[PDB]
Design an enzyme around this catalytic site. Structure first.
Site, PDB file in Angstrom:
ATOM      1  N   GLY B  48     -48.041  46.328  28.160  1.00  0.00           N
ATOM      2  CA  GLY B  48     -47.926  45.631  26.896  1.00  0.00           C
ATOM      3  C   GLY B  48     -46.467  45.336  26.619  1.00  0.00           C
ATOM      4  O   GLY B  48     -45.592  45.739  27.380  1.00  0.00           O
ATOM      5  N   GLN B  53     -39.084  44.362  21.319  1.00  0.00           N
ATOM      6  CA  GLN B  53     -38.510  44.853  22.561  1.00  0.00           C
ATOM      7  C   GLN B  53     -37.581  43.826  23.216  1.00  0.00           C
ATOM      8  O   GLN B  53     -36.617  44.203  23.880  1.00  0.00           O
ATOM      9  CB  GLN B  53     -39.611  45.280  23.542  1.00  0.00           C
ATOM     10  CG  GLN B  53     -40.446  46.444  23.029  1.00  0.00           C
ATOM     11  CD  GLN B  53     -41.413  46.992  24.062  1.00  0.00           C
ATOM     12  OE1 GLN B  53     -41.023  47.709  24.984  1.00  0.00           O
ATOM     13  NE2 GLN B  53     -42.687  46.651  23.912  1.00  0.00           N
ATOM     14  N   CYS B 101     -42.435  53.806  28.236  1.00  0.00           N
ATOM     15  CA  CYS B 101     -42.093  52.607  27.475  1.00  0.00           C
ATOM     16  C   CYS B 101     -40.989  51.838  28.188  1.00  0.00           C
ATOM     17  O   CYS B 101     -40.015  52.425  28.638  1.00  0.00           O
ATOM     18  CB  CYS B 101     -41.643  52.989  26.065  1.00  0.00           C
ATOM     19  SG  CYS B 101     -40.990  51.616  25.080  1.00  0.00           S
ATOM     20  N   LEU B 102     -41.150  50.525  28.303  1.00  0.00           N
ATOM     21  CA  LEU B 102     -40.156  49.703  28.979  1.00  0.00           C
ATOM     22  C   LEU B 102     -38.794  49.752  28.290  1.00  0.00           C
ATOM     23  O   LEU B 102     -37.790  49.313  28.856  1.00  0.00           O
ATOM     24  CB  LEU B 102     -40.643  48.254  29.067  1.00  0.00           C
ATOM     25  CG  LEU B 102     -41.888  48.031  29.926  1.00  0.00           C
ATOM     26  CD1 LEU B 102     -42.341  46.592  29.782  1.00  0.00           C
ATOM     27  CD2 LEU B 102     -41.585  48.360  31.377  1.00  0.00           C
ATOM     28  N   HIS B 143     -49.670  52.036  20.613  1.00  0.00           N
ATOM     29  CA  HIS B 143     -48.319  52.111  21.138  1.00  0.00           C
ATOM     30  C   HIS B 143     -47.567  50.819  20.829  1.00  0.00           C
ATOM     31  O   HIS B 143     -46.394  50.842  20.444  1.00  0.00           O
ATOM     32  CB  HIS B 143     -48.363  52.340  22.649  1.00  0.00           C
ATOM     33  CG  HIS B 143     -47.020  52.303  23.307  1.00  0.00           C
ATOM     34  ND1 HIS B 143     -46.317  53.420  23.702  1.00  0.00           N
ATOM     35  CD2 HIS B 143     -46.229  51.242  23.621  1.00  0.00           C
ATOM     36  CE1 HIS B 143     -45.154  53.008  24.225  1.00  0.00           C
ATOM     37  NE2 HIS B 143     -45.059  51.693  24.196  1.00  0.00           N
ATOM     38  N   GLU B 144     -48.236  49.686  20.994  1.00  0.00           N
ATOM     39  CA  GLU B 144     -47.587  48.417  20.731  1.00  0.00           C
ATOM     40  C   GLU B 144     -47.341  48.154  19.246  1.00  0.00           C
ATOM     41  O   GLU B 144     -46.313  47.594  18.879  1.00  0.00           O
ATOM     42  CB  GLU B 144     -48.394  47.267  21.334  1.00  0.00           C
ATOM     43  CG  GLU B 144     -48.663  47.396  22.826  1.00  0.00           C
ATOM     44  CD  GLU B 144     -47.413  47.679  23.643  1.00  0.00           C
ATOM     45  OE1 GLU B 144     -46.329  47.177  23.281  1.00  0.00           O
ATOM     46  OE2 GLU B 144     -47.519  48.396  24.663  1.00  0.00           O
ATOM     47  N   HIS B 147     -44.197  49.685  17.698  1.00  0.00           N
ATOM     48  CA  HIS B 147     -43.002  48.870  17.921  1.00  0.00           C
ATOM     49  C   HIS B 147     -42.732  47.916  16.770  1.00  0.00           C
ATOM     50  O   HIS B 147     -41.585  47.711  16.374  1.00  0.00           O
ATOM     51  CB  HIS B 147     -43.139  48.045  19.197  1.00  0.00           C
ATOM     52  CG  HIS B 147     -42.785  48.790  20.445  1.00  0.00           C
ATOM     53  ND1 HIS B 147     -41.540  49.324  20.698  1.00  0.00           N
ATOM     54  CD2 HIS B 147     -43.523  49.036  21.556  1.00  0.00           C
ATOM     55  CE1 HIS B 147     -41.563  49.849  21.928  1.00  0.00           C
ATOM     56  NE2 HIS B 147     -42.747  49.698  22.485  1.00  0.00           N
TER      57      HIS B 147
END
Ligand code: ZN
Ligand code: ZN
Lengths: 171, 171
Positions: B48, B53, B101-102, B143-144, B147
């Site tokens: 995702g 981000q 997480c990226l 999780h998304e 953000h």
């Protein structure tokens, strides 16, 4: 000689370290460790280093940096060998600091530790000490003892929002 | 085209994202973003990705991976565009997972989120949805959305002892 510095996630870093005996510190092996530990710390440009970080569960810690690149502001820390340390806060006052750890590469997190402590320990020659420490060293010492108890600075983070990667934090 | 993925420590990642208007999603700019976001996520081998981000404080999220290398076990996630999502837990039950997480490279931490949720959102064409989600996707979606509210998974860590570097965690 430099030894491998375990990274967070390695179970060794969360185990308890056992005290060093007065005999052991005479052994040729103990002396090699203190040598490698220092060699490892200076190479890592560290301020301190605990045996568990390089894989040994012994209550052993070395400090000393002077003009440390990784932490610009910081005052010099004379080289000392700290064995079997036992710490006790002497104040509730803290001096927040953006701590880092050689076992937690590329990051920094805000930590508030007591700025005045009592530390009891024994040096490489078996000399006993019981002094009250303050300032930067109080932070370094507390940070290093936590290691001997399987505690890392991320466990004492004040706010996960005040935590991140170096290059980024430095903006 | 791939865009830069901000790393933890960058203040943008802790700011609130604002909702996208029904007009805006028609703009040629919005469409370019969804394109870059997907392009960025696939390249990062992500599951995702939220607009913040890559530096945009808009309530925009894209998902979809199928046979994701970074997370072996995980089931496929069809590609969807999630806009202005609003989530609500429907259970207290959780299915712990070692999230990554990226924006938090090289690490993984154990997180327990509710395994059943209600999500209300709008897609790229402006279609409204209000479905109950479960399983892996429930985790990805939660999780998304975090953000979009300036929350990262490290803020929901269950135990700092269950957190570390990938190569190490994998032993
Ligand atoms: Zn350390
Ligand atoms: Zn993420």
């Amino acid at each position: 000689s430099v030894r491998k510095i375990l990274r967070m996630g390695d179970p060794i870093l969360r185990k308890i370290s056992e005290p060093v005996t007065e005999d052991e510190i005479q052994t040729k092996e103990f002396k090699k460790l203190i040598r490698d530990m220092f060699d490892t710390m200076r190479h890592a440009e560290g301020v301190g280093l605990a045996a568990p970080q390089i894989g040994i569960l012994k209550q052993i810690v070395v400090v000393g940096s002077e003009d440390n690149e990784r932490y610009p502001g910081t005052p010099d820390v004379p080289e000392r060998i700290i064995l079997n340390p036992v710490i006790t806060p002497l104040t509730k006052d803290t001096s927040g600091f953006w701590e880092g750890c050689l076992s937690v590469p590329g990051m920094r997190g805000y930590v508030e530790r007591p700025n005045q402590i009592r530390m009891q320990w024994m040096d490489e020659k078996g000399n006993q000490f019981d002094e009250t420490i303050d300032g930067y060293k109080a932070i370094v010492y507390q940070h290093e003892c936590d290691h001997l108890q399987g505690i890392l600075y991320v466990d004492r983070l004040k706010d996960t929002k005040l935590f991140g990667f170096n290059e980024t934090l430095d903006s």
